[PDB]
Write a protein that binds this ligand. Structure first.
Ligand SMILES: CC[C@H](CC[C@@H](C)[C@H]1CC[C@H]2[C@@H]3CC=C4C[C@@H](O)CC[C@]4(C)[C@H]3CC[C@]12C)C(C)C
Ligand SMILES: CC[C@H](CC[C@@H](C)[C@H]1CC[C@H]2[C@@H]3CC=C4C[C@@H](O)CC[C@]4(C)[C@H]3CC[C@]12C)C(C)C
Lengths: 48, 36, 55, 39, 617, 262, 157, 93, 118
């Protein structure tokens, strides 16, 4: 199940970075972690 | 408090001076009173 | 069913998973109720046919 | 209390819930509705 | 979100240097150009400041003075406003749990310019938080109802269940209740319905300060014997503003403002005239505010400054004055002066009351009009609103108001924080607790249950102490009922605690345990000896100066040797205890309990044995 | 301990007093108008007091009666403002029957320090013994040594009969031991295993009959060491209790004198 | 009506002091509703230090001792940080001085404490005797039986 | 936190008349709700700052409802007679 | 009706919601944890006034309330909502609180016998 969770994170990660090649640069390596952790649980909500 | 005892007749001592001579003899150092 | 403390002792103390599995499948038990109670269920039969004339 | 407690004592359902098993019979059609958007 | 921190630069200029920061000249305020002078240039010499002020780099401090003198209207207003921005942005900061320096300006913006978080706090919606460990992010087991928030929808107060009120820093117990009547009711009229009340009064006092102040002197005696003499009464009437005494007045019905103002002036002017020169405490320390870290409070350090603050406090009071008693207050009777101008200014303040609240005949312009404390007409005070008056030591009075009704919509207003009126403080303290007050049983009960917590406890028993005088706290167990049939008399139990009274076995128990604590105290004594010995035989690097520092140093050296003794006794006596068995531990624990004074740290040998107990800590 | 719990824990044991018909204590005033009351743990004592009153005043003795008051009320009588109902030296004391005083005196002197001085009313207890309910185990306190031994002999014989058939379970399992030993000494060829199991049998029966003489020595050991104390000290500790000793006190139960006999 | 409770309070307090003194002497010789409320008009630490500006303590007693004893991500929500900031600014406005009517941002908390607290530490079992076999038209039942079975058979191929 | 106050009403107290705040969808209304036996409702009500209000609730149950039940049984005949009286006499005088 | 439960663009329902080019809109989302199976994807549900509905009749047993089935269902389905994640500093609507395909949100309503006026 740990392998499965890692592959799930993997799918989300390469999907997102293929979506946004711009900040796919390693500069946002910690920023893309903040976004993948958010996208791996549910959808982010605005205030409205 | 309490009362010291000595089973010699069993003498006693209070903080009057009882002596429950086996009967009774409430010495002094006369039971005419009543609480209120 | 009553379990002696040895059973879950060997279960929990066992680090391995299938070691726990062996401790579980091998553990025994006892039943005090077999020396105290004998339970049975009965229905008091009927003696009048539900559709007959006397009914 | 209960019976067989010993065997009772021995994936990502926690992240995306359980799968509903009363709606398998529609799966096929759903796939069609994704291969032919013009419908 | 919070956590916008900074670094620790010297902003508080160690004000012992501020004499030099104000008695200097040739300075200015500004910054040179980045061409030839780098960032950080504060001293501009004759040639330097010359070319600076002749080139337009920085204008002299003299030039700032003549500018602020000549610049008027919007220019000076803007100047002062943005320099206030500057000082509130980089000169005073708050300090969080980490040690950050959050400015006043950025946090002020964070508080009043965030409308979304304001609206979120406006509602109460409880949003669970996800566990920051990655796998599932399931909500944390925190939960919680927060008995303050569980209390909205109530009317009077906020039932909060003890420990919550303690961790919320609610340290003002209640001491007395009374009322101010327009007419006291008479039994002999039908039911006494004639009696119309006007206000409901109750008094509160800071209980820790009460236990520290009056608990060192008046604690430990027969309460009635302490109440019998007028010294205690003079004390509680004079020691008021040091406890932060507070009085709450709740309007029992609707009241027009004018009559209330007139009645209060009438009822307090008479106390204000027959007022004698008072006794005031003497300042032992200056206690500067804490500029760099506004919150930072000093007392947590002071009361454990060397952890032996007795002698250091003695040295502090050596300057100002000596404590006139055991409580620790160095009193001071008002002089021949300061007892006539003060009362005159107080009477002046009172004579300005009835039309300050009511200026002009149209109430629509009055201050209380425009808030729910009074009727929409502005002419009557709404029933249920209450006034809070608290007294600070050096003649400070703080008054606030609170609307009545549902706890969720209540408001709180700060009305005025006056200062310097010793007359007003003494007059109100006497009006509530003096020889002739506004209601006698109020002040009588106040003195009584103010004696109450000085014995260690507190009213409203927020520690669930099974020996509180008023409201004990029971244990859950049922009182065992002995049976007649000998069937539960098991005798198979392992070990039974000893609960018999003074007997033969207890005697020898105390005998051997006393022998071993004798050995322990002897070991602590020789520890004292060799500790001070190696301390004296140390090659001391000491320059002949700093006599108070030398006193403090040798005193805390004595303290360290006391610690040597305490540790040695702890070790040897712990050995003794694990040797003797459990009943000896029970005996030592019980003796440590009974010997401890109920009112203070350590008081009414027993001192030796409960110090051995505090070593067994 | 809160006052109410102490009161609830003392109730099952009463005392006796002599009074007027109008519910008033009769006092023995002596010198300097100091007056002493009384509470007796046996009605014979109040009877002696009244039949002594009759020989020097027949009026009071003809009016006096005996009242049986639960110790709750007398405890309340003590710890109140005694000057509220009036006190110019109204000294209440207790009177224990000298039978238990003699028992406690001999128990006191045999323990090592011989003395002919006793203070207060005796309370007996025996460690190891505790009466257990369905939920929690209480510890009893016996005012009369008679019910004390009445309980402790039955308890001792029950527990030691228990120790005996515990040793009989040991002994049957050790008959099994000797069986497997016969399957362990010479059923096979000579060598390491067989001599090791000889030493096995040796150590096994050694520890078995060592536990035998152990159970016999506790059979040889006297009944649990009975400890005696003063009632006044017990209640003074009960009232001003807090902490661990509070938890200890919270399970004391007082047995009624002459309750276990009838 | 508070007076009576006060009488009982003073009685119990004197009993407390006296019993402990008596037991202390004895043991060492052997060796040798009206008041359930609370408020807070100012933060406690501020009043405490503004008062200790005038007191020389030889030692701290039980209450202040427990106070400085308790002195030294579960709440990481933005609302909690907003509340802490409100607390800070309220404290600064309180101890900063030393329409013309200002309104506080936090409601003054008046509170009540409880009295009389405790210390800190299927399937059913009906049975019929004889199962009622329906003993004691039918052609159609027979016919539908054979039809259903035969139709299943032909649908098997 | 959109509901301000609930008022239990009825003879057996299982209906409520909920009042909504100004921030609620649709402003401030009064809505009737019938309640199922849910033992977690009251904690949810108090821990959200709702003014929960109840009735008087008489303890008799049989002396309370006995003059109103008599009326429930007798009034229908009065209504029927009044209606037909209107028709056949207040018109056909 | 199974096709009116979600906002799939199935062409057996009335064209309530259309694109500019007049195509029915869809709201499917691919469920990253379990691809290859469309019946486990997420989708928003249609507003209740636009639904076709069967209305079945059911008789409940005598112990329907003390068995707690309705209570368990309610307590489970109302125990999920938006949360704050500090690891990303965001407001997250977790996946296990969203509706999959064909699932809806139950609304329970009780009637009053006194509203009959027979
Ligand atoms: C509960 C008794 C109550 C009197 C208490 C309040 C309402 C009175 C006493 C202090 C006054 C303030 C004095 C100085 C300030 C600031 C100044 O700039 C303008 C006037 C203003 C706001 C005044 C506003 C009105 C104030 C609070 C009634 C019943 C007598
Ligand atoms: C009088 C007995 C007692 C009232 C306590 C209040 C009503 C008294 C004590 C403190 C006073 C004020 C201190 C500062 C203010 C503001 C200033 O502008 C003018 C003087 C004035 C009004 C003072 C007058 C009103 C205040 C609050 C009982 C009867 C309530």
């Amino acid at each position: 199940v740990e392998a499965a969770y890692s592959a799930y994170l993997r799918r989300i990660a390469e999907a997102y970075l293929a979506e946004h090649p711009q900040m796919a640069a390693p500069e946002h390596a910690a920023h893309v972690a903040r976004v993948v952790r958010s996208r791996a649980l549910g959808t982010p909500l605005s205030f409205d | 408090x309490x009362x010291x005892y000595x089973x010699x007749x069993x003498x006693x001592x209070x903080x009057x001076x009882x002596x429950x001579x086996x009967x009774v003899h409430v010495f002094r150092k006369x039971x005419x009173x009543x609480x209120x | 069913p009553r379990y002696s403390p040895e059973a879950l002792a060997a279960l929990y103390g066992s680090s391995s998973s299938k070691g726990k599995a062996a401790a579980a499948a091998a553990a025994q038990h006892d039943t005090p109720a077999l020396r105290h109670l004998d339970v049975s269920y009965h229905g008091t039969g009927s003696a009048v046919a539900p559709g007959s004339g006397t009914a | 209390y209960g019976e067989g407690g010993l065997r009772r004592l021995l994936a990502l359902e926690a992240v995306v819930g359980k799968a509903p098993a009363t709606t398998g019979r529609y799966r096929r059609d759903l796939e069609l509705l994704l291969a032919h958007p013009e419908l | 979100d919070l956590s916008r921190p900074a670094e620790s630069l010297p902003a508080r200029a160690d004000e012992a240097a501020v004499q030099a920061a104000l008695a200097d000249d040739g300075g200015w305020v500004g910054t040179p150009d980045p061409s030839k002078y780098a960032a950080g240039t504060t001293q501009l010499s004759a040639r330097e400041l010359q070319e600076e002020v002749a080139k337009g780099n920085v204008m002299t401090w003299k030039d700032f003075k003549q500018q602020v003198s000549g610049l008027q209207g919007p220019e000076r207003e803007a100047l002062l406003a943005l320099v206030a921005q500057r000082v509130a942005a980089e000169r005073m900061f708050f300090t969080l749990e980490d040690g950050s320096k959050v400015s006043l300006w950025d946090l002020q913006q964070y508080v009043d310019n965030n409308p979304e978080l304001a609206a979120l706090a406006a509602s109460v919606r409880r949003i669970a938080v996800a566990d920051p460990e990655d796998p599932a992010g399931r909500p944390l087991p925190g939960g919680g109802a927060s008995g303050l928030d569980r209390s909205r929808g109530l009317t009077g107060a906020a039932h909060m269940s003890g420990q919550e009120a303690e961790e919320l820093e609610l340290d003002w117990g209640q001491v007395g209740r009374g009322a101010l009547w327009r007419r006291r009711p008479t039994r002999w009229l039908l039911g006494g319905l004639d009696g119309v009340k006007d206000w409901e009064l109750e008094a509160y006092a800071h209980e820790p300060l009460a236990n520290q102040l009056l608990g060192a002197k008046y604690g430990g005696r027969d309460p009635r014997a302490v109440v019998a003499d007028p010294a205690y009464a003079a004390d509680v009437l004079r020691a008021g503003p040091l406890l932060g005494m507070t009085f709450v007045l709740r309007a029992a019905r609707d009241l027009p403002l004018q009559e209330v103002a007139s009645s209060w002036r009438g009822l307090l002017g008479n106390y204000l005239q027959r007022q004698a020169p008072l006794s005031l405490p003497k300042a032992v320390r200056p206690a500067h505010l804490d500029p760099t870290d506004l919150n930072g409070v000093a007392w947590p350090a002071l009361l454990s400054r060397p952890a032996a603050a007795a002698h250091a406090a003695a040295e502090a009071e050596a300057a100002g004055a000596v404590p006139d008693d055991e409580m620790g207050v160095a009193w001071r009777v008002q002089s021949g002066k300061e007892a006539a101008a003060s009362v005159a200014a107080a009477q002046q303040l009172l004579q300005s009351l009835p039309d300050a609240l009511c200026p002009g005949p149209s109430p629509a312009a009055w201050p209380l009009t425009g808030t729910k404390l009074v009727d929409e007409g502005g002419r009557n005070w709404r029933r249920g609103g209450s006034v809070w008056v608290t007294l600070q030591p050096e003649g400070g009075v703080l008054v606030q108001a609170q609307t009545g009704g549902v706890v969720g919509e209540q408001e709180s207003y700060l009305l005025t924080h006056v200062q310097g009126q010793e007359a007003l403080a003494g007059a109100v303290m006497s009006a509530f607790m003096g020889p002739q007050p506004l209601d006698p049983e109020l002040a009588a009960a106040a003195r009584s249950v103010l004696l109450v917590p000085a014995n260690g406890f507190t009213a409203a028993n927020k520690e669930r102490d099974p020996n509180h005088p008023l409201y004990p706290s029971f244990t859950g167990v049922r009182p065992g009922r002995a049976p007649r049939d000998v069937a539960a008399y098991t005798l198979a139990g392992g070990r039974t605690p000893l609960l018999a009274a003074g007997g033969p076995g207890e005697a020898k128990l105390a005998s051997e345990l006393r022998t071993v604590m004798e050995a322990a105290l002897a070991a602590a004594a020789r520890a004292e000896a060799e500790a001070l010995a190696d301390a004296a035989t140390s090659p001391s690097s000491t320059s002949s100066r700093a006599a108070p520092a030398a006193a403090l140093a040798e005193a805390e050296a004595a303290e360290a040797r006391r610690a040597r003794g305490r540790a040695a006794a702890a070790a040897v006596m712990a050995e003794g205890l694990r040797r003797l068995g459990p009943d000896a531990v029970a005996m030592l624990e019980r003796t440590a309990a009974e010997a401890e004074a109920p009112q203070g740290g350590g008081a009414v040998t027993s001192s030796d044995i409960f110090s051995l107990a505090r070593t067994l800590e | 301990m809160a006052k109410d719990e102490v009161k609830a824990r003392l109730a099952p044991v009463p005392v006796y007093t002599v009074a007027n018909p109008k519910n008033e204590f009769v006092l023995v005033a002596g010198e300097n108008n100091t007056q002493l009351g009384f509470f007796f743990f046996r009605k014979e004592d109040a009877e002696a007091l009244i039949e002594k009153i009759r020989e020097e005043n027949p009026r009071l003795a003809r009016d006096s009666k005996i009242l049986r008051v639960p110790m709750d009320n007398v405890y309340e009588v003590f710890t109140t403002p005694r000057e509220q109902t009036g006190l110019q030296g109204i000294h209440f004391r207790f009177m224990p029957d000298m039978k238990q005083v003699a028992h406690a005196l001999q128990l006191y002197k045999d323990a090592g320090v011989p003395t002919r001085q006793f203070i207060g009313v005796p309370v007996f207890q025996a460690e190891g013994l505790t009466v257990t309910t369905r939920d929690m185990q209480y510890v009893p306190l016996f005012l009369c040594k008679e019910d004390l031994d009445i309980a402790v002999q039955s308890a001792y014989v029950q527990r030691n009969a228990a120790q005996i058939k515990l040793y009989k379970d040991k002994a049957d399992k050790y008959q099994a031991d000797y069986d497997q030993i016969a399957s362990q000494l010479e059923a096979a060829a000579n060598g390491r295993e067989r001599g090791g199991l000889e030493s096995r049998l040796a150590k096994a029966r050694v520890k078995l009959e060592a536990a035998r003489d152990k159970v016999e020595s506790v059979e040889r050991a006297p009944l649990p060491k009975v400890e005696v104390g003063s009632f006044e000290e017990v209640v003074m500790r009960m009232t001003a209790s807090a902490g661990n000793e509070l938890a200890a006190w919270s399970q004391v139960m007082f047995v009624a004198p002459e309750l276990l006999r009838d | 009506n508070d007076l009576i409770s006060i009488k009982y309070c003073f009685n119990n307090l004197y009993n407390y002091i006296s019993n402990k003194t008596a037991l202390s002497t004895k043991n060492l010789f052997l060796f040798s509703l009206p008041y359930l409320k609370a408020i807070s008009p100012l933060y406690s630490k501020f009043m405490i230090d503004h008062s200790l500006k005038f007191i020389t303590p030889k030692t701290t007693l039980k209450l202040l001792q427990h106070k400085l004893n308790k002195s030294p991500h579960s709440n990481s929500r933005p609302l909690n940080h907003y509340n802490q900031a409100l607390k800070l600014i309220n404290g600064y406005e309180q101890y900063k001085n030393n329409q013309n009517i200002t309104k506080l941002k936090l409601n003054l908390t008046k509170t009540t404490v409880p009295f009389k607290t405790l210390i800190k530490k299927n399937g059913h079992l009906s049975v019929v005797s004889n199962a009622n076999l329906l003993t004691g038209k039918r052609l159609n039942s027979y016919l539908i039986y054979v039809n259903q079975n035969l139709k299943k058979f032909i649908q098997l191929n | 936190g959109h509901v301000a106050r609930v008022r239990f009403y009825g003879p057996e107290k299982n209906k409520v008349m909920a009042t909504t705040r100004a921030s609620a969808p649709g402003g401030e209304r009064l809505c009737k709700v019938v309640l199922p036996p849910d033992p977690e409702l009251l904690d949810h009500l108090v821990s959200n700052g709702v003014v929960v209000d109840t009735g008087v609730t008489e303890d008799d149950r049989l002396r309370a409802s006995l003059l109103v039940q008599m009326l429930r049984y007798t009034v229908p005949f009065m209504v029927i007679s009044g209606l037909f009286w209107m028709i056949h006499t207040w018109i056909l005088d | 009706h199974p096709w009116s439960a979600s906002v799939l663009g199935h062409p057996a329902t009335h064209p309530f919601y259309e694109d500019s080019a007049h195509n029915r809109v869809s709201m499917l989302r691919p469920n990253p944890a379990a691809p290859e199976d469309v019946t486990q994807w997420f989708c928003a549900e249609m507003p209740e006034w636009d639904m076709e509905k069967y209305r079945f009749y059911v008789d409940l047993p005598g112990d329907f309330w003390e068995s707690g089935v309705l209570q368990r269902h309610l307590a489970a389905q109302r125990a999920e909502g938006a949360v704050w994640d500090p690891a990303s500093g965001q407001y997250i609507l977790p996946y296990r609180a969203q509706k999959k395909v064909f699932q809806v949100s139950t609304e329970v309503q009780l009637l009053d016998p006194q509203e009959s006026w027979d």
